[PDB]
Design a binder for this molecule. Structure first.
Ligand SMILES: Nc1ncnc2c1ncn2[C@@H]1O[C@H](COP(=O)(O)OP(=O)(O)O)[C@@H](O)[C@H]1O
Ligand SMILES: Nc1ncnc2c1ncn2[C@@H]1O[C@H](COP(=O)(O)OP(=O)(O)O)[C@@H](O)[C@H]1O
Ligand SMILES: Nc1ncnc2c1ncn2[C@@H]1O[C@H](COP(=O)(O)OP(=O)(O)O)[C@@H](O)[C@H]1O
Ligand SMILES: Nc1ncnc2c1ncn2[C@@H]1O[C@H](COP(=O)(O)OP(=O)(O)O)[C@@H](O)[C@H]1O
Lengths: 155, 459, 437, 439, 449
């Protein structure tokens, strides 16, 4: 899904005439909820009076300073996941193909810079299997995805 | 592709098809046999006062009860109010046995139905460049930057709609759209105004045969303008705002692309979110952009709500932004479902009942059932003689109202099978023994069904 | 071949005259229930007309009289055009979706949307991929009759690259959408490789013209449209079951667009039949929703069955006729049934004989008629198979009096099992104590 | 709009003596309970005394929620005031006790103060370097006030905000350096005549004076529940809006209490204790009271004010009765304030206030008849008659309402005292606990 | 600085010979309960305890939980004390016996020394070195780096795994960012731009810190206070390391799960391995279950096997019930709500009601604790209300009577202020009397019965 350009939202922007009798492609006929969506009309408007309603949760979450606030609690213990001590080579290969599984890591973090070079100096446009970095943006700026904090020049 | 059938575009007959409105005067006094109703004067006058209260925008959390026995016209008055208000004012007809969920608490589906019952009308503008791309021709700058190659100051795009074409000069930072979206000659795009980043809709239909096999969607030319400056009215219910702020629709990561990929779960909504949305909607009303329009939450069968729900309804009706709550109860002295202690009137607790404008509903006279039969018969199209009307009215007075409105379809079928066009006394006297009522069924059940044996029922 | 002789196998339609609605007795399996079958014929003739929306037809009567038989006769005598839905009432009480929504989906299944269109598809076996690294290319495809060379421009070469199409595959292109669907490989290249992979399935070559266009009549239900528009890749949810409380705004948009399709002539709405078997298992929390869902324009003609007499309603504590609340019985119409005379019992056992290809002597048929009169239908119909099998053990062609008496001696009817229980109470666990001798 | 508690503008007592005025700020007609609620309000505004229980008992339609909204309007938008109803606690997502714990911890505000750094001035040039097919971005922003001429650098988020805002040359923007928002204030030049998709000509502002890097000290108030949710989850933020918080373990609360105490000692934060209002507490079962009695034992408990309606009722989840439906090990902790039914010379002025709020003009004969109706059917029928008589007088085109309009509204809409008789007359065409007939 | 209901309690107030001296350190009287609580406290502080039952009987309003706060302030800060209720364990994710065992292992603490191995440097050269990547769908994969860390005294140029590179990459470490690679998990927190790249013309609002002094490969020891339930949660839902289970396991929502018997035994063996290395010290604690009669019979069944463990904290139950019916099975009545089989484990401590002078002393202590000074006639009036009405009713008539005193310009509270606050604010008994008297019939001015 991460490399599928949505287009049925845009039909509501372009094909928006009373004469045009609400044209939809026949091979996308039953996707009705994909087609009539107020978000797609909302992202186009001159005044953002509906865009300032559709994501007011993020605006209130930012204006309360719930990102810059120092993280008060943290878990008292952490651990790696339990592994199997089985003394064959196949167990080690299955561990390094499931618990690490480089397809998901490549799909999550992004492309190798060598792959960026061979995709951006080529004669023709080519796609990338992680088309962008699919890691989600962390929702706490000062302390992201770890638990390792330090004293604060404030204190 | 899809082949259009040239048949008759009729409609289907429901139980409330003939209702077309209240049928009042210009002074509010009801008039009998008008717009579907027969009689029921005071209830239609009171519902006209309710309709006037709704369209006057003075209702801010009232509550209206519809008493009266079963089969007397409460849902008929509800659909009359919903067709009297129109379409541009919301109407959410939930039942009592629809708040019981298995994902959320049952005092939350009520609040989501309140938010479904409130509408918000927003008037805005839409400024887009539109159509199929003909040229993408750059223009060299007057002073190129030293150390680089090309230096392009204005990018030209020729957009051709289905009415007229137009050349367009643009800022050069449209290139990041065009490389990322792969826009070429013969692809319809739209360019917005607030940001200005074109997004391809598809290959046009005129270039649907330059190749043979390489196919995608072949969208037609935009049959409209090339410079839309069109204004839009847009109706969003506050339920939609609650959902779009709680669960965001479109994100770009893994876990929100699993959230829309896994099943959407109803989740309970914290009250700070609703308070914030009310505080901002009441600000955009004061700016003079959005109009608030309250609607009707017709909670049918209000005796199925237990005592844990009316407690939440007291809080929800004391909110400053709330629709009207038209209940519908058809019980006398009943035990409330939650607390099996107090026998209260209508299934409503005595604390909640004081909020309610109680509208009665009376039984029908034995010379009005035949007028309802005539209106229902000319609604379905089933025509019939006057002695047949008198026999159906006899069955209507002596048995039930809903039963004499259901001896019209098998009588019509047996009529046009026997070889006639109108229904006589013989067809109804034959169809009265193929479709027994509840009374003769209970008579067979008690008399013939003596006890549990071989050829007997299972008590 | 996944089709074995059940109880409802001889009923090939309702079996009434289609002109004047006269239920002739021995026709299409059903035997001698003339008034109820006439009433079901009137119901079926107002189903196929499809104008009158949202009735409710209860079929009362004693057990072992034919209430599901008439329902299967109405199911067989509609065809594949008008839908039908066999839902017993205990299916509703789920743990993932509530009772209201799991009963709304029973109404949303029984209304079809019918749409006719032209499918512009292209079958074909790949012969040679010719890519001109200069963008352009040529594809050579063949069938059992023809062979052609089609041009390709820029991007479906990349679609071939993403699909990894080798020479010998069976590709299919929907030219109205343009996406390659590799169907597998051909039997003409099974001789080529030796150790095949996992994904490869072998197929015959396509036959006839490459460009196949055909007018096909699609018929979906409203429940299909509701579940597909639930989530993003939600089409597999209706096979899996991984759906829950669908919101009302989606169903509102879908009903509005189905009305819009009926206006523009694209779609034809076909109302169908919902069959709620054993309706007395529903509690009052379900009848309070059925009394409202029979009001809309999009409501199927509900046919329901029942057994019980004056019984309690589940969920509450007061007796009522047929196990149904009286505000619901003021709304429905009731077709009573009747028990069977022995003259009908004999030919019903004859039809159950000729369905199971079991030959019976007339003395055995008379004895089995007396057993059916003394014990019921469901025990008499379960003695044809047993007498045939006991005749097969002693190697006799026709069953006789001896085999039917043997089957009556071995297996007990429910009339004697009650006397067996009340005869020996000290050993069966009644409610408190067991003797254990 | 005009709800059922929009005329109330506070509690209406004195500031030096807190004597109950007989007619002041909407809450007109009662003296004992308003004085006691003024005392409760003063010991909430003191903020020292923690963990009490106030039970506003009395007959229905006597203004209990009116006194609660009077205290709510009297605290202003500083102190938290949770309007919890007692049926919201019975969730299916989370447990019944943890919903109470969240309802207590939503009513302890923490008021922190932090310094942000805001910019101001006219943008002179934008310089954005972008990669091809995924990659980092580079940014140089030259900005000028009337005095300084700075060339700042930018990161990825600043460019993602600039392109979202479409900041061209000649805009008066103000960038918060800490949070990172961009608010265009207007322009100083005019719109160019070279490009088409430019936009809308904004407000004409001049070049701002002063300095670029200005400092600002903002005040942010979060409840303890928001701190619990943002410190209980690694990435799953925003679940404090969409209610997706399953359970917060006790190891998280016993750390956040200690850190809030440390923030209190350091002068970083200040604890503002609040009010938890529980409307109609008689619906809670005994499993809730066995936790409510012990959550009022710590320094971080809010002063609970709660209402009731019932006489000797049976407590839910049990088999026995008690006054107000509350257990007698919990009624020792509480302090009960009684309310009395009204007198007609007070119902007259209450209906006068409700009529002047909904913009309805009356005649004194209609007001006398309305008071006569309100003696026998309460305020809850009389206010509905006020609004209904207003619209019926609007239908027949009359300036002021009259006796005939009130009689019309009394004829159309029954009070409950006549609907009880309407039930008791026709008992054969209403579904009781038994069957029903049809004529 | 908020006077709660329990603020004056500062301990049991015991002598050197373990004899309770009355009116000392907050309490008034209550000898036979405070001596037994001192015995319980020294049973806790001797570590010969693997599950003992201590019941605190007595009617409501007699100070059962005041003894509990006295115990919790007598043990100290460094001994675990888990107070819960009987209504807290009815959850919706897990069975309630799981919540019982989670509280039992909250009540056992451990003090562990750890040796963290930080690499605290400033990043000089960051260059990836990918390996061979044949046709397998995903494409290239970075497998080796060459990050050069530059501390103040002696730089170092080290080589990394793919996983620690992904730990870097999800932190957005450019060239110049000081970091601190933690080679226990693999985590690495960016601290800020080094001050060699300092520029006041900046916009990112970065935190400029100087170069970390010392060796780039430091090694530092710390002391940590970890309960066994923390180890249970750590090994149950993993959130440490740089693999996929421990990274996709911190983006989901956290759910309480059922930590089984095998994990609770394996963590016991791991902790015994820590103790045998002379590193960790075990300190058992208290589970204070207030309102134990709300627990049903399915919990008193499981407390038997939970107390038979070789490691189990001491349980202190509180129950203000007489002969009552157990919540689970409604056909056997017993004392306190405790079943008659579970009651034999318990060392039952009684608690007796008070006296008309002990109420006066408690009123005086509570008044000088809250900060409300008053006269002796007012103290006698409040003690009269304490004898007649209740104990914890008359304590609550001091907080309005202060405010009302400040209404009338006074400082000390006289008889008039309490005589007015006894009329504004009512108790439960006179309110029920007004309820029964005035609420004669249901109707308009009645009560909903
Ligand atoms: N005044 C009326 N005029 C015409 N038809 C009526 C009238 N009142 C009721 N009906 C018919 O009676 C039928 C049953 O009434 P219904 O609305 O089901 O009663 P209830 O509201 O108690 O459920 C409806 O189909 C409606 O068409
Ligand atoms: N008229 C009939 N002719 C032939 N077979 C019948 C007839 N009526 C019923 N049966 C058979 O009797 C059996 C019982 O009917 P069914 O509807 O299942 O009884 P019940 O209503 O008790 O479920 C069915 O298997 C059916 O095949
Ligand atoms: N003393 C009062 N002053 C102003 N309005 C009052 C007063 N008493 C009652 N009301 C009005 O009567 C209505 C009922 O009061 P409310 O507190 O809702 O009753 P209840 O406590 O039974 O819920 C409220 O809308 C309020 O506006
Ligand atoms: N010995 C005592 N000295 C001082 N105050 C006491 C004493 N015993 C009880 N109290 C008071 O009684 C009040 C309630 O005691 P608590 O332990 O909550 O009662 P219960 O035993 O019913 O839980 C507390 O506020 C406390 O101040």
């Amino acid at each position: 899904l991460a490399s599928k350009q949505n287009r049925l939202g845009h039909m509501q922007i372009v094909y928006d005439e009373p004469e045009d009798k609400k044209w939809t492609p026949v091979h996308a006929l039953f996707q009705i909820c994909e087609r009539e969506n107020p978000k797609a009309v909302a992202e186009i408007t001159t005044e953002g009076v509906l865009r300032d309603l559709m994501n007011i949760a993020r605006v209130k979450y930012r204006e309360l300073g719930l990102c810059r606030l120092e993280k008060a609690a943290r878990p008292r213990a952490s651990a790696p996941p339990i592994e199997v001590v089985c003394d064959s080579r196949s167990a080690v290969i299955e561990r390094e193909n499931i618990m690490f599984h480089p397809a998901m890591r490549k799909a999550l973090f992004g492309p190798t810079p060598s792959e960026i070079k061979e995709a951006s100096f080529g004669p023709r446009p080519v796609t990338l299997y992680p088309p962008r970095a699919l890691l989600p943006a962390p929702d706490h700026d000062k302390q992201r995805f770890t638990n390792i904090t330090v004293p604060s020049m404030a204190r | 592709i899809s082949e259009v059938r040239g048949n008759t575009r009729d409609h289907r007959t429901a139980a409330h098809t003939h209702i077309k409105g209240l049928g009042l005067n210009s002074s509010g006094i009801a008039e009998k046999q008008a717009a579907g109703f027969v009689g029921q004067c005071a209830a239609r006058e009171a519902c006209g006062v309710v309709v006037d209260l709704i369209k006057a925008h003075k209702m801010a959390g009232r509550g209206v009860l519809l008493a009266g026995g079963p089969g007397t016209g409460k849902t008929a008055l509800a659909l009359a109010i919903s067709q009297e208000l129109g379409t541009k004012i919301p109407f959410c007809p939930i039942t009592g046995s629809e708040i019981y969920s298995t994902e959320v608490k049952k005092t939350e589906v009520l609040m989501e139905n309140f938010r479904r019952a409130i509408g918000l009308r927003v008037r805005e503008t839409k400024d887009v460049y539109e159509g199929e791309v003909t040229e993408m021709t750059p223009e060299e700058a007057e002073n190129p930057l030293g150390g680089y190659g090309k230096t392009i100051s204005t990018l030209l795009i020729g957009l051709k709609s289905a009415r007229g074409q137009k050349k367009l000069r643009l800022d050069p930072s449209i290139y990041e759209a065009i490389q990322k979206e792969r826009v070429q000659v013969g692809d319809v795009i739209y360019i917005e105004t607030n940001t200005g980043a074109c997004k391809r809709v598809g290959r046009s239909d005129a270039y649907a045969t330059e190749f043979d096999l390489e196919a995608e969607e072949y969208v037609p030319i935009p049959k409209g303008e090339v410079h839309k400056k069109k204004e839009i009215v847009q109706d969003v219910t506050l339920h939609d705002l609650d959902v779009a702020n709680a669960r965001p629709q479109g994100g770009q990561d893994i876990i929100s692309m699993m959230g829309q990929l896994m099943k959407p779960k109803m989740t309970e909504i914290t009250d700070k979110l609703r308070m914030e949305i009310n505080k901002v909607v009441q600000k955009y009303i004061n700016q003079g952009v959005a109009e608030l329009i309250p609607g009707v939450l017709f909670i049918d069968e209000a005796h199925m709500l237990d005592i844990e729900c009316f407690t939440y309804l007291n809080k929800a009706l004391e909110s400053p932004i709330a629709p009207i709550v038209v209940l519908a109860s058809n019980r006398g002295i009943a035990t409330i479902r939650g607390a099996d202690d107090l026998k209260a009137a209508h299934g409503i607790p005595p604390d909640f009942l004081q909020r309610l404008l109680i509208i009665p509903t009376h039984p029908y006279e034995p010379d009005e059932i035949r007028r309802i039969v005539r209106i229902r018969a000319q609604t379905e199209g089933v025509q019939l003689t006057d002695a047949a009307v008198d026999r159906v009215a006899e069955h209507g007075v002596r048995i039930s109202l809903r039963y004499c409105l259901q001896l019209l379809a098998p009588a019509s079928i047996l009529a046009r099978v026997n070889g006639r066009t109108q229904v006589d006394v013989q067809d109804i006297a034959e169809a009265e023994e193929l479709f027994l009522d509840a009374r003769r069924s209970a008579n067979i059940l008690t008399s013939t069904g003596e006890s549990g044996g071989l050829h007997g029922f299972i008590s | 071949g996944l089709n074995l002789i059940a109880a409802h196998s001889h009923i090939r339609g309702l079996g009434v005259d289609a002109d004047t609605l006269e239920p002739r007795p021995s026709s299409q399996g059903l035997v001698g229930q003339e008034k109820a079958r006439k009433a079901a014929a009137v119901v079926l003739e107002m189903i196929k007309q499809g104008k009158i929306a949202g009735r409710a037809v209860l079929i009362a009567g004693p057990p072992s009289t034919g209430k599901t038989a008439i329902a299967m006769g109405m199911a067989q005598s509609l065809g594949q055009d008008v839908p039908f839905t066999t839902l017993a009432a205990s299916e509703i009480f789920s743990l993932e979706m509530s009772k209201t929504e799991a009963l709304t989906q029973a109404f949303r299944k029984s209304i079809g949307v019918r749409i006719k269109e032209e499918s512009e598809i292209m079958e074909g076996e790949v012969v040679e991929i010719q890519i001109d690294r200069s963008k352009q290319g040529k594809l050579t495809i063949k069938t059992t009759d023809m062979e052609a060379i089609y041009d390709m421009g820029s991007k479906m070469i990349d679609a071939m690259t993403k699909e990894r199409v080798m020479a010998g595959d069976i590709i299919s292109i929907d030219k109205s959408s343009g996406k390659i669907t590799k169907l597998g490989r051909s039997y003409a290249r099974s001789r080529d490789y030796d150790a095949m992979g996992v994904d490869t399935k072998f197929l015959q070559c396509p036959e006839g013209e490459l460009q196949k266009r055909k007018e096909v009549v699609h018929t979906v239900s409203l429940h299909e449209i509701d579940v597909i528009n639930s989530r993003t890749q939600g089409f597999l949810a209706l096979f899996s079951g991984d759906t829950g409380e669908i919101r009302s705004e989606i169903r509102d948009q879908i009903n509005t667009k189905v009305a819009e399709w009926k206006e523009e002539g694209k779609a034809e709405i076909v109302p169908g039949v919902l069959f709620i078997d054993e309706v007395h298992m529903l509690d009052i929390e379900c009848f309070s929703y059925i009394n409202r869902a029979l009001e809309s324009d999009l409501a199927p003609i509900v046919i329901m069955a029942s057994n019980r007499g004056v019984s309690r309603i589940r969920g509450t504590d007061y007796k009522s006729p047929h196990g149904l609340p009286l505000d619901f019985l003021d709304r429905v119409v009731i077709i009573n049934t009747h028990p069977y005379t022995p003259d009908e019992l004999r030919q019903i056992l004859s039809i159950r004989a000729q369905e199971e290809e079991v030959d019976l002597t007339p003395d055995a048929l008379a004895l089995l008629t007396k057993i059916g009169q003394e014990a019921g239908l469901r025990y008499a119909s379960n003695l044809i198979t047993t007498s045939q099998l006991i005749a097969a053990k002693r190697r006799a062609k026709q069953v006789g009096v001896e085999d039917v008496q043997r089957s009556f001696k071995l297996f007990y009817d429910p009339a004697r099992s009650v006397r067996f229980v009340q005869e020996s109470e000290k050993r069966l666990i009644g409610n408190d104590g067991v003797v254990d001798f």
